[PDB]
């Protein structure tokens, strides 16, 4: 109220749409009686409430999309697309502003056309955005010796007590802050800063301002080159595919994605559409555990994290729980193992799953394994580009922490760097300098 | 918390100096039809809405402009439509896909019939507030104001003023828009649906025999742009744009964003166009004056007292720099006075050289299907007679069955 | 030179073997209604012709073959008309010009009946060559055949057989090619233009009135895709296929040419597609085995004495490999014969898994209009019948408006 | 006849279509009543004989052709666009075959891409070809005691007296082989011939079997990066505007020149349909010449060369003649200077034509001004840019003499060589070599 600088906002008590099938439930239900690692701790009545809310609020997302990213997926697993993952390490409600989502749509966009240019292929653009409000906590404790942060969908950032309670209301904040994002997502991805006319300033501002700007220069006059070739050739914004960024987080907390299922088709299914694409975390798949029994049951195209502890042997049960049906590009498996390790530890775990039959989206996620230097992340995405081109499989994308603000947070890049509320991003230039050395990598 | 059902929000860049002066000086003037909670509660909501994502962004205002541009001209069609009021307890995927599919299914048959591009509004996203006549309804209690402002639930406490309804009310919208946004995008904008839409509409339609020749050439058209080698991938992506009456200021205010004809404009990105009722449109009032600051289109409701000299100083105030499209005038006069009343309107408006949208709304001051039929004629005979545009229809949707009946209807006022 | 009217030329890498051995064998078999012109002098003019530019080229037949498979899977009509004799005297870009006109107008009237798309083939660059029953004609001159072979005037002199006219017939071919591909790119070939020629057609026609309802829905089905969006920038262009009569030995064995579904084949350069007659199509004569050494699509023309037997041997020699739209069976059986006679030859044929193209000739075998209309009926009457395809029609153009007639009249065939 | 190895093909005499409008016959009276250099000598009445032939035949060309030229003519003289201009010295019946005419057609659209993407604009393409059968000649009589070969159009290459008789005959012989091969290339600009796609192979065989093939790998590779840039950001053939190559040739003979003139508008025109533009050459440029006036009254975009006597006050005099109505790029001044000459000659003409307020197209013809060596080629094209860049000018395109065939006429190129009818022709290696020498001038 007054005195203390907040508002309450009433959450309406609406009627409940029409249930889901008996069918879908009962096997949901099943997946659900698994145990579930790192779920809030708020009281299961709460829990069903907040969840009773959300079954009947418009999706997220709708299933035409999630089938569109789907086909676009099988392209990537056939090596005729490149995958590109990005945006915030942790979303927050404060920072859920359109400076900050205009600024990582236009990250992922200058990053998406010099990857393109690089690869000479098609890049899937997923955005790390519209849900990534929810993160796993090794510590019991925090240094400051509180419940930990456990992201926005949970419990709140401020140091004290009170805002560490986990509260499910967030999960009704979570979907009002995620509808609103994707909302603006849709709206900038149909608006001029869409426009391939725009990378002319963008590279030209990037090499302009970076002091290793010159060692990018040939490759940022190329692409201008190539772009004034297209123009010259009679190709206007009007002659070219709306712009198509799509929607992920990690599906961490299952009361949210549960009761964001909804049905659609031809045999019936379950479609988590409060995103295009989840992915399960290091600490939470399990593989008799919910999350990988919730991904089963879904439709949307998954990823798993694989980090150094990853045997080939699990990597293939991933394979068989989540691909049963040999659906290229309906499972991701990304590579997190750090820049010493990936070239020792991936090699094994790919030739076991490429035996399979199965075809799996490769993807190098090159923070979670590596405060974070950009050399061991350029390194260990080097890394995995030298297991591919050994093993003559497809290097199918990169899953990166972003923002299109000039913060301070990653070492290194050419401003020699000696407002996250989770693991360090890559600036502006930094995610922009990735993606120029990676076109190099796809180019080699 | 979940324990007292709410969420719990902390509350804890300047405006060039002549639009802080102007949008200021326009908020100073006396404005009807506002919610009585109190100014200390309202400019904390107000401070939540200020750092919202927006449920529009200014290069659609834009575009709608040129498209609006086009309606004045002669050369384009305007369709609004959609709730009377929207419902934080309707505000539903099925509810929202239903008025979405009504809205297509009514653009593709005035369009067949107009031989022109139809521009589609719908009231949504925000169509949250209505004025009252009287304070206390029927019941005697103080009246529903609409969801941004009070409940619909017949008990006093319900009906108190709470100022949480303006966030709650941008919550509704923004999920609203981003459904609307991907369906116009998805298999549901697909030309191809309207054969058995239309199919459907003339076999479960009482008079439903009475359109089955129109429904007939309209699937013959479809079928002939499809068989001359033009499929989905060849056609604009379906734009609906989103309007709602600019009723509660502090709403409007809340939702104003600075974008850059090069030069800093306050646009209003709770919606691409707002409309001004016959209840708030106080020529020197705070609404008015509101409009003349926003770069967006504008509508303002014409009822049966409005004369020819207060609609010049409407488009004079409104349209200052004769930009077509910015400007629509919404006649709602009745069927039995719009034949009589709208004539020497147009005449004098039309003299000034300044290029409106007249739009009808025969909603509002007529609810006898008939009746509304007639007053869309009579707007028509108005037009023609006088050989100015008749260049769009405001309706409220008249159940989904009627509404397409309006819509083949005016088709062949549109042919005739 | 110049002072003996005659233009001079001076005459002074191999077939695959199985290609020489199988063409050979073709030209060896009895051919009828060939020039009587001595084998030196027609060696001669063939050795001229072994060189020049094609009338087309491999691309387009490949193309058209895929669009008449379409036709011959019912999602298509094949439109097949021109003059029923090209004679150089006519042979002008105004006569071309009208030609071109003719087929666009008509191809667009029976694409808004059949919901489909029109393949557009003319009797055009090359239909130079006619069969004739009597050698000598009523006059008691030997019959004209042609330019090709010899002259229209009535004296001896002029009906003698000139190899010469080969040149002259690939000269005037060629010229005549290069006008519809500049007509076929170039403003003439704006759907735009349908609306004042239909209007023409209307105000200008005794039974104009019977057409003005289905000329005014096809004006607002154009309107419709404009009002979609769609412009001449975003359709196709219009696409005309060079077809005549494959007649004249010495003419189409000079126009062939090798080109690679990898192997190497023959192509009858002359024409996109060339149909065998009535006179000509002996099972084991030289023309049905020229076409069998051919790449091109090819018709076979069948008259009232055609038997179920014979026209599936017909079908099993010149669609061997089970390629739908190679072949063409066009009907010309009379109106009072075709209702009768073409079932038991569809059934037969259908019954095999082959799919050729049905086509209706309602000319060749009747001449009044209504007989001509009658037999196109009797065709759709005879594949409804059986729930096959009635896959088009080809015309002699009746004049400018009965061929426009008769295109209203097909296209409310096609609506049945 | 059987006796000499020819055949006489009869010259049907066919019915005149109506004449052109009296008004229009008047003005082409006064021009043709001007004295022509370099014509024909064969008798009035077989010239009038002939002349009625095609005076009913149809065109080569259609007016709508000529006015979309002229709109992409204007933005060449507006520098948003370049022209290439190129194809035979001389064309010959004989050699009027598919094979050479589908290697003139690949040869331009291979040297337009490369000039598209070296320019970074619009590549407008003319061909020599369908009418250049005519030639001027300074000698009376030749090396071997006859009369000159003046183009199959006028008599035989054959060196025999008979064959060298000026024949009118070849007036229809000229229409029936411009007629044919202008069908083929309508035939082939829609055909596969005409795919982007195609590119790829094209340069990459010039890159391997050029001895100077390293040098020009660079620019091969970019632009292949380029296409498949376009191809991976959606772009299909069925997405771009189809290959327009217009036709052109010298206006030699006038009997031909008025015979295949036609009417059309919005005020009453005369067009020259045997081609779509047509330029005045070095011999028959008299400024109160029948060739002047004759490009004074048709509609169709007209050339005028100019030679190393050029004043700036006679070249202002042909704007003032040839685009009274201040139309950009109706008129196209073509520079053939030397090499040794144009950097000293050019620069005065620019200068005063540009102050006119007159905009035409500067061309480049580095052929007629200097066998004929690669490098002085190359470096007359070199000079001309350094004109143009010192005056602020655009250097708006270049006028060539090729051949699709390896022919060996021109000396230097990487093949270092130590058919034509007429002037040597750059081959297919030298021509496509310019064309990769032009891009860098472009770049530079
Ligand atoms: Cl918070
Ligand atoms: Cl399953
Ligand atoms: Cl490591
Ligand atoms: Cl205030
Ligand atoms: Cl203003
Ligand atoms: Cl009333
Ligand atoms: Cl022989
Ligand atoms: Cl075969
Ligand atoms: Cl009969
Ligand atoms: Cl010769
Ligand atoms: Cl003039
Ligand atoms: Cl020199
Ligand atoms: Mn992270
Ligand atoms: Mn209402
Ligand atoms: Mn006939
Ligand atoms: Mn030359």
């Not at 499910?168 to 997502?185: D, G, H, K, T």
């Not at 297209?230 to 198509?244: F, H, I, P, Y």
């Amino acid at each position: 109220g007054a005195m203390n600088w907040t508002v309450d906002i009433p959450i309406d008590q609406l009627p409940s749409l029409p249930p889901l099938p008996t069918d879908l439930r009962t096997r949901l239900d099943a997946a659900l009686a698994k145990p579930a690692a790192q779920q809030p701790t708020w009281p299961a009545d709460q829990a069903l409430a907040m969840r009773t809310v959300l079954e009947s609020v418009p999706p997220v997302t709708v299933p035409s999309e999630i089938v569109r990213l789907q086909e676009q997926l099988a392209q990537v697993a056939k090596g005729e697309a490149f995958l590109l993952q990005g945006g915030d390490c942790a979303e927050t409600f404060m920072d859920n502003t359109e400076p900050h989502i205009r600024g990582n749509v236009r990250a992922l966009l200058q990053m998406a056309v010099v990857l393109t240019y690089g690869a000479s292929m098609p890049v899937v653009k997923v955005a790390r955005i519209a849900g990534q409000y929810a993160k796993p906590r090794s510590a019991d404790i925090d240094a400051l010796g509180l419940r930990s942060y456990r992201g926005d969908m949970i419990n709140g950032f401020a140091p004290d007590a009170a805002a560490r309670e986990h509260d499910p209301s967030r999960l009704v904040r979570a979907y009002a802050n995620a509808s609103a994002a994707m909302n603006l997502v849709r709206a900038l991805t149909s608006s001029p800063l869409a426009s391939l006319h725009l990378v002319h300033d963008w590279n030209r501002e990037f090499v302009r301002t970076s002091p290793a700007g010159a060692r990018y220069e040939a490759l940022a006059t190329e692409i201008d080159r190539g772009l004034r070739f297209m123009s010259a050739c009679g190709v206007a914004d009007r002659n070219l595919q709306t712009a198509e960024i799509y929607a992920s987080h990690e599906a961490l907390v299952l009361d949210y994605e549960r009761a964001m299922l909804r049905l659609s088709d031809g045999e019936p299914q379950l479609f988590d559409l409060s995103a295009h694409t989840v992915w399960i975390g290091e600490r939470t798949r399990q593989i008799d555990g919910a999350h990988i029994a919730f991904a089963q049951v879904i439709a949307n195209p998954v990823g798993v994290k694989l980090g150094p502890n990853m045997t080939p042997e699990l990597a293939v049960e991933y394979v068989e729980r989540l691909d049963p049906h040999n659906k290229p590009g309906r499972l991701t498996l990304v590579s997190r193992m750090g820049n010493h390790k990936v070239r020792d530890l991936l090699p094994p775990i790919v030739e076991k799953v490429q035996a399979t039959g199965h075809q799996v989206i490769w993807q190098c996620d090159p923070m979670h394994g590596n405060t974070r230097h950009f050399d061991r992340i350029v390194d260990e995405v080097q890394g995995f580009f030298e297991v591919h081109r050994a093993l003559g499989t497809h290097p199918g994308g990169i899953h990166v922490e972003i923002t299109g603000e000039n913060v301070t947070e990653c070492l290194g890049g050419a401003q020699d760097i000696s407002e996250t509320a989770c693991d360090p991003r890559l600036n502006t230039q930094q995610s922009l300098e990735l993606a120029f050395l990676v076109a190099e990598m796809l180019r080699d």
